[PDB]
Amino acid sequence: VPEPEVVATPPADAGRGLIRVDSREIRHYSGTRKEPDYLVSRDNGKTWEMKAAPAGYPPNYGGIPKESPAIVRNPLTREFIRVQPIGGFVFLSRGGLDGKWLAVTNDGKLEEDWKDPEKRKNLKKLGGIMRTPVFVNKGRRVIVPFHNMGGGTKFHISDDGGLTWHVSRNGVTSPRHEARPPHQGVRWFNNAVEATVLEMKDGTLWALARTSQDQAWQAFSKDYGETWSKPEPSRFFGTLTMNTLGRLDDGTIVSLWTNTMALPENATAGNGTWEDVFTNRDSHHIAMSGDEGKTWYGFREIILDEHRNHPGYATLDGPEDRGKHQSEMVQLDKNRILISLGQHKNHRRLVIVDRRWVGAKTRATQTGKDLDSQWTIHTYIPQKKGHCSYNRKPSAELVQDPSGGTKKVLQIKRLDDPELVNEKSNVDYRNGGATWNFPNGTTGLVKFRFRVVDGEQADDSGLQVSLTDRLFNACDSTTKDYALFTFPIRLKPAPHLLLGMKKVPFTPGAWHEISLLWQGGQAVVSLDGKKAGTLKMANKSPNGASYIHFISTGSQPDAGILLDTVNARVKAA
Ligand SMILES: [Ca+2]
Ligand SMILES: [Cl-]
Ligand SMILES: [Cl-]
């Protein structure tokens, strides 16, 4: 099955400006303050180059340098509407992207002569931070989500193709984060911001919005956006990152988001007006639904941030926000989807994904071969750097397999590294760990191979093994508290699995395999092919399991354990 393929770096952060021109030509516009330009492919997304926009295309009067305006085709007129992420004007095309453009005036007319600064004074200016215009109701209405950081999302609405505008009665809101353990402070408050909107088959609109909770929140409209239901949590985990919904030609719904859990807030987190540090933006994910959202499949990692382990992460090539959050998509053919994702020139990417890979039911890995592409292992140096960033270290390293041969395997232990401690913030990220994604399942079988390192161990040394429904940081010792299933491998007094109350011993200094076969609210655990015990589900999930997470448990420096292979198979549902 075809794995995700990086094809280019877009000329702006992802989320706005990716637009199909015709069956073979696709563009990604930019936030340049100079003469406008775009990145273009003429082979349906495979190869790309920069090009200057023609003289009729208006500069970015509003916007910001790192974000393109959103550009959307009106399905009735086949012309385009352009709005910025913030500020500026509403432009409508006549003759397509490379035709004439006109700006919408405050009195519902079109201004052809927007190069005259005096004539720009009476142009319509839509307020707030805006996301993507979406045409709804057989193309007869266009709505543009907009927000205020603490005030919530509402919708700019036009019933005449962008000439005149009104505002929805209400929109989407979400509650402040409450500092309770394991947090030591409050998360940055965003009030249901950055909404993505999809029209459902029954005519309802579904809005999915970014929040300070553990998941995105959602509301629904029965009148094409004028009024919205009470907001509620969605099934899509994630915090303070962006959601994007779309629909393929055959009606399949696509959900793109960053499916992560941030580290718990520290003791210097601030009052929640602004962020202190980002610990959850190093991945992007996809799920799809063929039945109007009743059931979902996939929840697969599109990509991990290539810089995620590095001790210069926060400041390489300028301090601007970086990562793999934010996205926008264009279907390429029956099977393939082009996705722009991420932020910062060193991190943002255009990636082709295949729906047959989204719908796959198996995955396998070997740490020595697959660490750089598939494994999240980073710990953080807890000193804020750049803009709301931490520098990182790999929390685990590859070593020679003690059995001999050429295999390299991953050593997971409690680290002797004082640079991973901040006593004022009260965090200690010295427990190394590792986590790996697989296609989502409410029933499945995962197997992994591990070995105890021959060396000094602490009294609490071992490995906490968890199945989770989003990506928890490798160094997050609270993962078990949120997990679907979890158990410890304990090394003292002698090595054993603890499965409820049952201890199951095994030999140190030898490779062993453990299997977890989960279904509903319980999992069966096997060791070296023999049933060992059972586990009761610790937390329910709206979706199922899509990660296995391993974290060392020693509280003093130890030798730990080695991890070799993992494989997963899930049931179709
Ligand atoms: Ca925070
Ligand atoms: Cl840029
Ligand atoms: Cl503009």
Numbering used by the authors: 25 to 595, 598 to 599
Question: What wording appears in the published article?
Answer:
At the catalytic site, R234 and R305 are shared with GH33, whereas glutamine (Q367) substitutes the third arginine in the GH33 conserved triad. A unique signature is the substitution of the tyrosine catalytic nucleophile in GH33 members to a glutamine (Q350) that is preceded by a histidine (H349) in AmGH181. Strikingly, Q350 and an adjacent glutamate (E218), both invariant in GH181, are potentially hydrogen bonded to a water molecule that overlays with the oxygen in the catalytic tyrosine of GH33 enzymes. Based on these data, we hypothesized that AmGH181 adopts an inverting mechanism that involves nucleophilic attack by the activated water molecule that overlays with the oxygen of the catalytic tyrosine in GH33 enzymes. The initial emerging signals were for β-Neu5Ac and α-Neu5Ac, in the reactions catalyzed by AmGH181 and AmGH33A, respectively. The first site is adjacent to the active site, where an inhibitor molecule was modelled, whereas a galactose unit was modelled at the second binding site located on the opposite side of the catalytic site.
Mucin glycan utilization requires the removal of protective caps, notably fucose and sialic acid, but the enzymatic details of this process remain largely unknown. Here, we describe the specificities of ten A. muciniphila glycoside hydrolases, which collectively remove all known sialyl and fucosyl mucin caps including those on double-sulfated epitopes.
